[PDB]
Amino acid sequence: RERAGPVTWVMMIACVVVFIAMQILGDQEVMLWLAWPFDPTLKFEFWRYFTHALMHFSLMHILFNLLWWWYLGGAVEKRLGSGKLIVITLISALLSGYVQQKFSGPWFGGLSGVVYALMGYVWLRGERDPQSGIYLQRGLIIFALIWIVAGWFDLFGMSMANGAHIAGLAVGLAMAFVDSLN
């Protein structure tokens, strides 16, 4: 009956805890603890290449990111196992974060590069390997596209980490090409 596996569940708990902390302590204070290394002296605090994905600055995006995390990530963990979801998550957070700060610096956050990796991965893995038992529904492809399109044309009030989203998508596509050559 329960849809979310342990990894799916633990990532949602972490995001909520961080989000609470950003209300109590404020956004900037948490960014300093968790953002991508913003100084050379912090290049070995290894959590920071991943913990940027846990911070949200707006209610609307924590909602939608956790929604597709819960749905897509939940599907990957249930059909492909926990470790597989873990790997997609870590690599996508790493590389999306890399491409983002390269062209825009380190002050970004959100779990959406990981989400876009999951979209791409679920999708292409279903397209190229239907036996796997995962598939990106058409309704979702549309919702995803509109959301992306909104981000890229700035239809939210916010500043968007587009590099990280497109990077994220790319990673998930690549991983699914590899995985689907069995």
């Binding site: 956004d27 911070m55 600055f57 825009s104 968007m160 989203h165």
Partner: peptide
């Protein structure tokens, strides 16, 4: 901050 920029969101992803």
């Amino acid at each position: 901050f920029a969101t992803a």
